[PDB]
Ligand binder design. Structure first.
Ligand code: NA
Ligand code: NA
Ligand code: NA
Ligand code: NA
Length: 327
DNA sequence: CGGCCGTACTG
DNA sequence: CAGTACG
DNA sequence: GCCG
């Protein structure tokens, strides 16, 4: 953790976010990787060639780094559309993405007041706007613990054998957490079927859950619950809660997926692809058949992965503690 | 030229 | 399906 | 945007 180029990545992140909200996701992914490189790196970049030498940084990006050091600014930033700040504001409503934000902007909306009174909102967006400020805040990990304990307690209350674990940034050892990721499974391998009903209707008794964003409860094969909860007592804020229930055989891949980070998973899955293998939150497969565009055309076969170490091993990668998975 | 991860809900 | 979301 |  030593940002030796904050002054540059600072101006780049602004541009990356602008491209993201406008919907230019690949260009944004490009900047996102170059930005991290310039951070993870060990000294202030002082040359056009030091830069190029850095993975994730090409000529085009190096040139821009130059401008920041020689000129102190980036003329590219002085031509960003005036719509960006508004698109970013609209895009921060849970449930609304680049497409919805661009539409609202097109319709003449410029503020949350406009959205609240004139915009047509999906059930999810109404909930997101309702907790707009709350969904932008991170929580002390200590509170994440209380939330994971509240979920786990209600789960083991009707089946003491249930294994509950908090993943995400929590397991990666961060000081604060954006939301709480709770993974639930069962050692026997069957008793995890159709438990969402009991867990969710148990957490609703005690009034712990306040809003539901994603919860397909009419289906017995529900895999995830994305919602909102709030601990009891004064001074509590609404927090995002994400729960997944998986079969014990998929426990390791699930744990690995849910622990992240997101960029870490993508990188790992990208490696598996170069090796004709495939990785998901369900399993690690080998002998996968893909076409010219890297799209799966053949299923291949699932490899036994009892633990996270097995996944790294099978991929010919040295294991990495959760805390060492921020990218 | 063209992929850039592989999934799960919603309506 | 497109959109949005999860890590 | 980067990279193979
Ligand atoms: Na350009
Ligand atoms: Na959003
Ligand atoms: Na999280
Ligand atoms: Na539902």
């Amino acid at each position: 953790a030593t940002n030796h180029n904050l002054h540059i990545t600072e101006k780049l992140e602004v541009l990356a976010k602008a491209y993201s909200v406008q919907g230019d996701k690949w260009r944004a992914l490009g900047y996102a990787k170059a930005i991290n490189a310039l951070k993870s790196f060990h000294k202030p970049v002082t040359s056009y060639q030091e830069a190029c030498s850095i993975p994730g940084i090409g000529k085009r990006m190096a040139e821009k780094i130059i401008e920041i050091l020689e000129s102190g600014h980036l003329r590219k930033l002085d031509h960003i559309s005036e719509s960006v700040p508004v698109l970013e504001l609209f895009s921060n409503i849970w449930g609304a993405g680049t497409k919805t934000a661009q539409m609202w902007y097109q319709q003449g909306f410029r503020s949350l007041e406009d959205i609240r009174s004139q915009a047509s909102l999906t059930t999810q967006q109404a909930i997101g706007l309702k907790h707009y400020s709350d969904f932008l805040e991170r929580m002390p990990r200590e509170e994440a613990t209380e939330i994971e304990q509240t979920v786990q307690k209600a789960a083991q209350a009707f089946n003491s054998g249930l294994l509950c674990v908090a993943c995400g940034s929590y397991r990666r050892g961060k000081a604060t957490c954006g939301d709480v990721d709770v993974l639930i499974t069962h050692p026997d391998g069957r008793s995890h079927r159709g438990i969402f009903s009991r867990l969710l209707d148990s957490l609703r008794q005690e009034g712990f859950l306040t809003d539901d964003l994603v919860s397909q409860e009419e289906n017995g094969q529900q895999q995830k619950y994305l919602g909102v909860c709030r601990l009891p007592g004064p001074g509590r804020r609404h927090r995002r809660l994400d729960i997944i229930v998986v079969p014990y055989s998929e426990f390791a891949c699930a744990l690995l997926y849910f622990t992240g980070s997101a960029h870490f998973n993508r990188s790992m899955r990208a490696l598996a692809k170069t090796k004709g293998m495939s990785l998901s939150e369900h399993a690690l497969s080998t002998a996968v058949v893909r076409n010219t565009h890297g799209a799966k055309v053949g299923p291949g076969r699932v490899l036994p992965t009892p633990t996270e170490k097995d996944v790294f091993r099978l991929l010919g990668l040295p294991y990495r503690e959760p805390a060492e998975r921020d990218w």
